[model samples]
Target: ESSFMTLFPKYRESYLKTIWNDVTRALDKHNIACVLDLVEGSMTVKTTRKTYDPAIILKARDLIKLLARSVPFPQAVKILQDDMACDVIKIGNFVTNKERFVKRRQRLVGPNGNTLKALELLTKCYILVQGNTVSAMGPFKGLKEVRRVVEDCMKNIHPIYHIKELMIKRELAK
Candidate 1:
């Protein structure tokens, strides 16, 4: 049997321990079996004999990773949908200078979250810019666009540039 395992941070451990039932229930719906090992500080999902979709295990793995990254249960569970996927972009590795890294990370959000809001609307993805990582969820197309915008933003190019480019491309696709 194929199985996947992921470790959870202490911060999310508390939440998962309290709501373990919910996690089991969600996975059970897709005929996947889950085990939350508090002693080992990890979560596991494996396909059962009743499992129908071979790809569902991958989505189950994504769900727990999102949960560990602090994505709300409701939003993270949506990854189970056929068209839904998630991306955890690591922004911490791009810049060695601490201050510059913080500055570039903030640039992605802009003042009062307007920049992030714009990307969400254009790419149709839900993004959460947490400490060193950005968690994004949406269709595969939007996930790809968000990755480029985020990686470029960290590389010192502004998201506004990608925003404008996406705007034109989307219109032309019509």
Candidate 2:
């Protein structure tokens, strides 16, 4: 058997310490081998002859990458599954005015996250709005929908318009 590994050292000081248990369990359930060294910021997902698909291990690699990038554990885990992807949209450079920037971020999150929640339901994606960037995880279709909505919000267009447009999409539509 050969060894496969991935390194992600730029995460928050306490992130892996807090979430490595769940991550380990998820990989174990999938029958992948791992040695996560949070102290040195190294992680490895090894493969054996029995490791039928390297894609699963790579997906797990990227899932932890997303976690190191500040995505929540719950949402990052989805990256381990099929037809799922992620994106990070930059917002600070898009809008210069401080107040407008605040408004734009708020537009994506909506009142008490109502707008974000609606879009998540409609597109079946998990969206998180943070300082100067928005992160999302879901299928290609779901990620596409979220990226567009985030961009629209950054361009000073309300996400509500996209919310309506998403209404026309069927869950099974390509």
Candidate 3:
């Protein structure tokens, strides 16, 4: 089998330590062995020496990187098991003013996260607004929409404008 090495940054060790079993089982189901290095801080995935890597394993390579980069465990694995992909958008650097940053960040999340939930439902994507970055998982189309909305929010355009368009698009689909 093909082999890969992915290193999770130290900050992600918190969640990785907790859900280590789930990740290992997920790899096992794919016939991949996961060897996590507690000291060296990396995980290795390999199949039998004579085997070839499946398409899924190639994709899972990125998934492991995403997991270490702060995407949630559930969503990170979706790229392996489903027709889903993830995008990590760096948004905090976009705003020069602290107040605009806070305002726009809040705008992306909406009040009590209502705006974020609206965008998620409309785009059928899972998004997490962490600090100045937004991580999203969904179909290619949905992922694009999430990126668009997040960028627009950082640009100081209200997400309601995009949500309005999504609302009409979904209505037409039904």
Candidate 4:
């Protein structure tokens, strides 16, 4: 028996309570059972006897993790797909200087999010830059690219560098 539990933010309580039923139904389709424990401020998923895919429990964990990161439910649910994957890039600890960290994180966004827009189009990933983490969901390949781009941003290398490289690499592949 495989099961996973994830804690979410207090602000998400109201929203999760409203959609608990939908989450139950979604996981139920895979013969996986889910419990939304309002008392404990966490969501738990377990596999039942009929559950066939062993990896699905992990996928459900990703789903809850994304929800906890404040990713919209519609976008977060996509993590349930077989080919879909998620990455939570923690940039807070990447830089010890808080002011420098904020500046670098904003550099990834560029003016009016134009830089992030280019990166998303190139990588084919839905990225949410919030708080100290960047939550992204997409195909496995794209998730890797998203992680590289985000980590590089934290390391003081501009995402534009990778964005340009990806653009050229993508055109060559086509």
Q: Give candidate 2 regions above 4 Å deviation.
A: 1-12, 29-51, 97-99, 168-174
Which residue pairs show backbone clashes in model 1? none
Per-residue lDDT tens digits for candidate 2, residues 61-100, read: 6776566557878778888778788776778898779998
RMSD of each: 1.7, 4.0, 2.8, 1.5
For model 3, the superposed segments whose C-alpha errors exceed 4 Å read 1-11, 35-52
Query: Model 3 TM-score?
Result: 0.80
- Model 1: per-residue lDDT, tens digit, 4-44? 99888877888888877898899999889989888899988
Give the local distance difference test score of model 2. Answer: 0.76
Rank the models by lDDT, top first. Answer: 1, 4, 3, 2
Candidate 3 lDDT, 119-173, residue by residue in tens: 9999999888776668788888999999998998898787888999999999999
The C-alpha stretches of model 4 lying farther than 4 A from their native spots are none
Whole-model lDDT per candidate = 0.90, 0.76, 0.80, 0.88
**Per-residue lDDT for 105 in model 3?**
91
- What is the TM-score of each predicted model, taking all chains together? 0.91, 0.73, 0.80, 0.92
Q: What is the lDDT of candidate 4?
A: 0.88
Ranked by TM-score from best down, the candidates are 4, 1, 3, 2
